[PDB]
Amino acid sequence: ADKELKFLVVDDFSTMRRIVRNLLKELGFNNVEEAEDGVDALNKLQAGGYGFVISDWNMPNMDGLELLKTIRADGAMSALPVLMVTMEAKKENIIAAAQAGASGYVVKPFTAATLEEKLNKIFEKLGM
């Protein structure tokens, strides 16, 4: 994928955003912004430029499933890749996110290898 691809990393806890931002750096992506909830995210997204979203589920203001649904329902960003990264591991959550259009889904805690594999899976599926 283009190493200038702009990522938005969303989670209500800085620890997790920090892990993901650093992993992306390792993979060669330095164009990375953070958001703290679904609303914060949509604000940055509607500020334009973004090529990929990585998002938590449980967050105040707007959760990640609502964020995913909003993104997929907006004609201007409906195809934006959205990778869920969340502690929700139940099959009903995976189903609900998948059905809502998640590009991929990683369960916390995750390894560096896992994030890399699932990002690449999405890149390949989308021809990025």
Measured distance CA(62)–CA(53) in Å, rounded: 15
Asked if residue 63 belongs to a known ligand binding site, the reply is no
* 40 touches ligand BEF by CB under 6 A: no
Count, residues near ligand BEF per rule CB under 6 A: 7
* 105 touches ligand BEF by CB under 6 A: no
Q: Which residues contact 79 (CB under 8 A, 6 or more apart)?
A: none
* 57 touches ligand BEF by CB under 6 A: yes
Measured distance CA(108)–CA(46) in Å, rounded: 28
Asked if residue 31 belongs to a known ligand binding site, the reply is no
Measured distance CA(67)–CA(57) in Å, rounded: 9
* 96 touches ligand BEF by CB under 6 A: no
> Binding residues for Mn ion, per CB under 5 A?
12, 14, 48, 56, 58-59
